[PDB]
Design an enzyme around this catalytic site. Structure first.
Site, PDB file in Angstrom:
ATOM      1  N   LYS A  50      44.098 -35.046  42.350  1.00 24.12           N
ATOM      2  CA  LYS A  50      43.516 -34.318  43.568  1.00 24.12           C
ATOM      3  C   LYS A  50      41.860 -34.900  43.652  1.00 24.12           C
ATOM      4  O   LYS A  50      41.525 -34.953  42.514  1.00 24.12           O
ATOM      5  CB  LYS A  50      43.765 -32.773  43.396  1.00 24.12           C
ATOM      6  CG  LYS A  50      44.676 -32.417  42.746  1.00 24.12           C
ATOM      7  CD  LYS A  50      46.218 -32.772  43.055  1.00 24.12           C
ATOM      8  CE  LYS A  50      46.943 -31.906  42.273  1.00 24.12           C
ATOM      9  NZ  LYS A  50      47.352 -32.189  40.974  1.00 24.12           N
ATOM     10  N   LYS A  68      43.893 -28.264  33.833  1.00 32.76           N
ATOM     11  CA  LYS A  68      44.323 -29.417  33.008  1.00 32.76           C
ATOM     12  C   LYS A  68      43.157 -29.985  32.058  1.00 32.76           C
ATOM     13  O   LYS A  68      42.057 -30.533  32.819  1.00 32.76           O
ATOM     14  CB  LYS A  68      45.208 -30.568  33.780  1.00 32.76           C
ATOM     15  CG  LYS A  68      46.066 -30.326  34.759  1.00 32.76           C
ATOM     16  CD  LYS A  68      47.236 -30.928  34.825  1.00 32.76           C
ATOM     17  CE  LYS A  68      48.009 -30.469  35.946  1.00 32.76           C
ATOM     18  NZ  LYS A  68      48.672 -29.284  35.613  1.00 32.76           N
ATOM     19  N   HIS A  98      47.088 -23.714  36.568  1.00 34.32           N
ATOM     20  CA  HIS A  98      47.090 -25.215  36.856  1.00 34.32           C
ATOM     21  C   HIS A  98      46.156 -26.084  36.336  1.00 34.32           C
ATOM     22  O   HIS A  98      46.103 -27.264  36.290  1.00 34.32           O
ATOM     23  CB  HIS A  98      47.241 -25.085  38.467  1.00 34.32           C
ATOM     24  CG  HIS A  98      47.704 -26.431  38.934  1.00 34.32           C
ATOM     25  ND1 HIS A  98      46.996 -27.068  40.292  1.00 34.32           N
ATOM     26  CD2 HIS A  98      48.572 -27.584  38.447  1.00 34.32           C
ATOM     27  CE1 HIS A  98      47.714 -28.344  40.316  1.00 34.32           C
ATOM     28  NE2 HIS A  98      48.676 -28.465  39.093  1.00 34.32           N
ATOM     29  N   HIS A 111      49.478 -37.826  42.111  1.00 29.69           N
ATOM     30  CA  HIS A 111      49.440 -36.710  41.416  1.00 29.69           C
ATOM     31  C   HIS A 111      47.754 -36.188  41.162  1.00 29.69           C
ATOM     32  O   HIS A 111      47.776 -35.173  40.663  1.00 29.69           O
ATOM     33  CB  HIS A 111      50.355 -36.517  40.282  1.00 29.69           C
ATOM     34  CG  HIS A 111      50.444 -35.158  39.750  1.00 29.69           C
ATOM     35  ND1 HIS A 111      49.608 -34.434  38.902  1.00 29.69           N
ATOM     36  CD2 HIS A 111      51.331 -34.210  39.936  1.00 29.69           C
ATOM     37  CE1 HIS A 111      50.024 -33.349  38.459  1.00 29.69           C
ATOM     38  NE2 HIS A 111      51.196 -33.123  38.771  1.00 29.69           N
TER      39      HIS A 111
END
Lengths: 441, 441
Positions: free
Chosen positions: A333, A106, A104, A331
DNA sequence: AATGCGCATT
DNA sequence: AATGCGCATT
């Protein structure tokens, strides 16, 4: 040009240009402006390979890319096929040996003639994620190359060069040893943020501190200061997906997860520290820029949700007038620790990690080991690394070292009418922004 | 001699002989009075083999016994060794292929020259269980042998001969085929009770009805009558051990277990049917005839208990003035369905089975199969098999077909002071009946 | 997607 | 005691 944080959002199509002056599109990230590229690397979960390639400038489009994904089998062969036309693109599958795990993280590594730039963000590499959504971006500064004769660590007080290397060696992929050595030849001393990784595995003893929420806990112990009346400073968690957190709050969230977040200074106490969780309502998605289609990126399952209605009384609305983003869905966090009046924050974190045990890690075998499923990554902003005690909240987003929070504070609790967004169930009752209904086929 | 139920308790040392006139000791069960024995069989969980043998009359002590147990390995070799001195005793281990399973059924088959007697009870075969405790016993009548020439099923309207045989064939032990054939040659037609077995396994479709609480449910559908205002008639469960029943009442107890118990008549409805559970308090064990040592037979673990404090608000005191047994602790298990004024009951059950999923069975794979761990067995008393609509509660235990309930009705709920008996934790605060404290070493 | 942690008696 | 059911992402 001016500011210390290097913290940005993505451009959002369909809002007043007031709000996108000082935001970034991916093309702005890969511009010639930021140096003459030699090769890149792209870490991510989902990829549109054709779209991606079109985001680089024509001048740089032939220069090598390494893609770093976690997919396997048909997902894999689709990706491999989708990248077949381009002879410069290589790939690196990263090993996910625990089940239900995601790659996950990025992140862009961007090698130029003039230095290195690391970029840690929250958007997938597909058009939909850079279009009408609210995302988070951190840019390093240009890290100059270390002179071949000279001997210097190139390290910062936040130990970022060393924390990042540890993150990459944890993979064991040969394709990344090239990127470790690239980092070793570069001066990363100007870095004013701490790194926070999750990597998959089961870790024991002193190793528990290396990853996940024990990593945050350790950093907060060693580099935050305990405020007067700290117990009344709340915690705020902001996210787009929700994992399974168990039968009640004591099982993980308000015991194990919340402990690590509220830690401050060396001295430990052993509470009614309010925890405000931010997750879009059904109505926040209805009235959005996309409408119900925004539900595509908010994957709270009905099966997961009904197991834990206890959670939902901690849930507050998405609300972001300060950025003009109330209708562009989250989107991104983020997690942060504000004062009771919300005028100042002890620290800010942006990260890839959602409210899940997969991402943050959870304890096994009676407190002895911490298991993590997924790869995640974020940067932590601390005043101690800027010679301050706290930050000050930028009352409006767009005056020196006051931190730019993207959402409105204080968070607003769900009404009686409100329920959380769940993508499994059909919303057939009132139409969305564009006059559509939602039937998950 | 007079009565229809054939329902008795065990003799209790240390109470006024008023109460033991009309109860039974094991020697009274094995007396010459009940016929000239040829061989017996003894089904049970625990065994003191020397003590057992001394309970038979000298005249019969050399005649064969088969012991039927579930023990394995060291438990097994101890039992096998303990029975080595006696050349007439044989053994039969019964197969327990699911884990945490017990061979818990307590039953005597007693072959004589003059017929057969089946005896289903609730006491282990050790001295402590027939001493100062409150137990349950059912005697068949003497089943005469079927004449060799004549052809008769020997079956009753309750299908007991056929229900019992099914129970024994389910083992597959060769040693029991002798006892199946013994039963086949005998006339069991006078039987006015229904049999209720649990045997270990996983059962699908029409097979779910064969065992456990689906067996009770089926019997109640097919042979009970739906009363006017049935929803207000409660359920009462009485037991000595508590299994793990899950996170809350919906998981098993008040959904799956309670449904099966409240069923009455063919027509089905789809409730606030009160459920009163009876389990000794810490104080009921303190003031008992034995004191804290009675805790030996009440094995509620602290680990099991703290998982399910929700259960405890259904818990009521042991109270049995009608039998003078308030101080003799319960190792009997009983379940029954009384009227709201408690003057009459629709049915009574005594059984080996505790409040556990092991014993009663619980559903797996989304309602398709029922898993049972343990062997259990009881008899159900129904008015329909006596041409009645209900029984009438014998206001005091010791006037024709009024059913003899051993405990006081209505049950009394736990006080604020009260907590349930748990054998794991030390009771060090107030001394017991004999001036002792409790420290589980 | 397919591993291994946690659970279940009297 | 040691089997196999149920669980866990974005």
């Amino acid at each position: 040009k001016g500011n210390p944080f290097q913290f940005y959002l993505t451009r959002v199509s369909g809002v007043k240009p007031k709000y996108n002056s000082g935001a970034l599109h991916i093309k702005d990230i890969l511009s010639p402006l930021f140096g003459t590229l030699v090769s890149s690397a792209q870490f991510n979960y989902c990829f549109d390979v054709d779209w991606l390639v079109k985001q680089y400038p024509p001048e740089f489009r032939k220069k090598p890319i390494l893609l770093v994904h976690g997919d396997k089998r048909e997902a894999k062969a689709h990706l491999h096929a989708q990248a077949k036309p381009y002879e410069n693109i290589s790939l690196c599958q990263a090993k996910l040996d625990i089940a239900f795990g995601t790659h996950h993280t990025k992140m862009m590594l961007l090698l130029y003639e003039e230095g290195l730039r690391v970029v840690i963000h929250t958007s997938n590499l597909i058009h939909a994620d850079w279009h009408q959504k609210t995302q988070g971006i951190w840019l390093s500064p240009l890290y100059p190359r270390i002179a071949d004769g000279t001997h210097k660590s190139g390290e910062s007080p936040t130990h970022f060069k060393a924390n990042l290397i540890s993150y990459l060696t944890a993979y064991n992929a040969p394709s990344l040893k090239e990127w470790i050595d690239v980092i070793h030849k570069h001066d990363l001393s100007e870095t004013n943020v701490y790194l926070i990784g999750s990597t998959p595995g089961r870790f024991q003893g002193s190793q528990k501190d290396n990853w996940g929420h024990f990593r945050l806990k350790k950093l907060l112990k060693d580099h935050a200061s305990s405020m007067p009346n700290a117990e009344s400073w709340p915690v705020v968690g902001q996210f787009s997906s929700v994992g399974s957190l168990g039968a009640d709050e004591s099982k993980w969230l308000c015991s194990e997860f919340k402990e690590s977040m509220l830690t401050l200074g060396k001295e430990s106490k052993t509470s009614s520290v309010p925890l405000y969780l931010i997750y879009p309502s059904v109505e926040n998605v209805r009235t959005s820029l996309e409408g119900y289609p925004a539900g595509g990126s908010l994957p709270y399952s009905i099966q997961t949700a009904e197991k834990q209605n206890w959670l939902h009384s901690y849930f507050h609305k998405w609300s972001a007038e300060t950025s003009g983003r109330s209708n562009a869905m989250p989107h991104i966090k983020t997690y942060m620790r504000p004062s009771p009046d919300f005028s100042k924050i002890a620290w800010f974190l942006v990260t890839s990690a959602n409210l899940s045990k997969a991402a943050w890690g959870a304890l096994e075998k009676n407190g002895t080991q911490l298991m993590i499923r997924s790869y995640e990554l974020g940067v932590l902003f601390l005043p101690s690394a800027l010679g301050l005690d706290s930050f000050k909240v930028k009352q409006k987003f767009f005056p020196m070292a006051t931190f730019p929070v993207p959402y409105d504070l204080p968070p607003e609790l769900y009404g009686s009418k409100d329920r959380p967004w769940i993508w499994n169930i059909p919303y057939v009752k009132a139409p969305d922004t564009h006059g559509n209904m939602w039937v998950p086929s």
